[PDB]
Amino acid sequence: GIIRTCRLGPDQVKSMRAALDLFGREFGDVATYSQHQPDSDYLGNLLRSKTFIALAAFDQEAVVGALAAYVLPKFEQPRSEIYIYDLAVSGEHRRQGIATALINLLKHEANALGAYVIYVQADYGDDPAVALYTKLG
Amino acid sequence: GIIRTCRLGPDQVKSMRAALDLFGREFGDVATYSQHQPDSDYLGNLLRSKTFIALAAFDQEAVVGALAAYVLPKFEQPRSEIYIYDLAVSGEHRRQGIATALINLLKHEANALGAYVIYVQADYGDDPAVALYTKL
Ligand SMILES: CC(C)(COP(=O)(O)OP(=O)(O)OC[C@H]1O[C@@H](n2cnc3c(N)ncnc32)[C@H](O)[C@@H]1OP(=O)(O)O)[C@@H](O)C(=O)NCCC(=O)NCCS
Numbered sequence: 001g002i003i004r005t006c007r008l009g010p011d012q013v014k015s016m017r018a019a020l021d022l023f024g025r026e027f028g029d030v031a032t033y034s035q036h037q038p039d040s041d042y043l044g045n046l047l048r049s050k051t052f053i054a055l056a057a058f059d060q061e062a063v064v065g066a067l068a069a070y071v072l073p074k075f076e077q078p079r080s081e082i083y084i085y086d087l088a089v090s091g092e093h094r095r096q097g098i099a100t101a102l103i104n105l106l107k108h109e110a111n112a113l114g115a116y117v118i119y120v121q122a123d124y125g126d127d128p129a130v131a132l133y134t135k136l137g
Numbered sequence: 138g139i140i141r142t143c144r145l146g147p148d149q150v151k152s153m154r155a156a157l158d159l160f161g162r163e164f165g166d167v168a169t170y171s172q173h174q175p176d177s178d179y180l181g182n183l184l185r186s187k188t189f190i191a192l193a194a195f196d197q198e199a200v201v202g203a204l205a206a207y208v209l210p211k212f213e214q215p216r217s218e219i220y221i222y223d224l225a226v227s228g229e230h231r232r233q234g235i236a237t238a239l240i241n242l243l244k245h246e247a248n249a250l251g252a253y254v255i256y257v258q259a260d261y262g263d264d265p266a267v268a269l270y271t272k273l
């Protein structure tokens with residue numbers, strides 16, 4: 001099959017948008033992730049920052065997995081923490097190690113970035129007004 | 138005897154440090170918030186950024202309340218969410234409406250920023266590897 005992963009840059013706004021559509025489909029909320037996407041200048045600036053990380057997995061050059069995380073530059077100490085906000089894999093590519101692959105790339109990014117920890121969603125998904133995270137490390 | 142609140146700017150690094158010290162005492166972890174604080178260049182830059190908000194409440198010109206929050210520029214839509222990371226009030230100034238006042242100031246900052254929602258870190262405190270947030 002061959003699934004490739006990479007960190008999206010300001011030059012890959014198109015894949016970023018494709019990753020957003022995947023989020024919409026996997027979360028059962030297409031409107032939220034596909035009908036009100038920000039413009040390209042905004043998406044380009046976001047992907048250009050060092051405190052936001054977008055990871056995508058490709059199958060036949062189509063987005064099949066996406067990971068969106070934020071880097072929190074801390075105030076108490078000169079250190080940073082990563083929080084995986086959204087993570088989803090195509091329903092047709094589950095249990096293949098894709099999310100695992102995105103997270104390993106994320107760890108690669110964290111190390112280069114210097115982040116000392118990574119939090120993930122202690123998901124049940126339903127979480128309307130609640131958002132729990134667990135320490136991946 | 139009158140509690141004043143305001144958002145800290147790059148020109149108030151000293152108060153930011155005092156707010157940090159406050160977090161250490163009230164959270165029962167002085168070393169983490171007081172022994173390894175970032176240098177002034179770093180605090181200055183953090184305070185000059187628009188995605189970070191530090192609020193402090195004073196009593197006789199001493200920091201007695203502090204609130205540190207991050208603004209997340211969203212990816213699915215051009216909107217932002219605010220997450221209160223740390224919030225604490227002097228142990229000797231509890232139930233005086235200081236947190237409530239810091240929170241109201243935060244809503245003000247959020248509104249001026251356009252943020253459509255604010256979350257607060259679920260506090261049973263103890264939560265080591267489990268950060269939880271609830272909508273405010
Ligand atoms: C949760 C989700 C992202 C996982 O995607 P995925 O690509 O199927 O996940 P993976 O195949 O990489 O790994 C799944 C499991 O198999 C395990 N695994 C990975 N590679 C493995 C291998 N080679 N051998 C054995 N087990 C393996 C992983 O540890 C994981 O176990 P765990 O969930 O108990 O921790 C996916 O189901 C999804 O998109 N769900 C909807 C959105 C959602 O709820 N997202 C929240 C994510 S925190």
Ligand SMILES: CC(C)(COP(=O)(O)OP(=O)(O)OC[C@H]1O[C@@H](n2cnc3c(N)ncnc32)[C@H](O)[C@@H]1OP(=O)(O)O)[C@@H](O)C(=O)NCCC(=O)NCCS
Pocket residue numbers: 163164224225226227230231232233234235236237238240257258259260262273
């Ligand atoms: C929790 C804390 C910040 C509140 O201090 P405070 O300034 O005395 O609170 P206030 O006088 O403004 O308000 C009094 C009560 O109204 C409640 N309240 C006010 N606005 C509220 C809101 N929007 N949502 C929920 N509760 C609210 C508070 O929970 C508080 O009850 P409590 O003392 O049993 O916790 C303070 O006790 C503290 O510093 N605790 C240690 C650190 C901690 O637990 N931080 C987590 C904060 S979420």
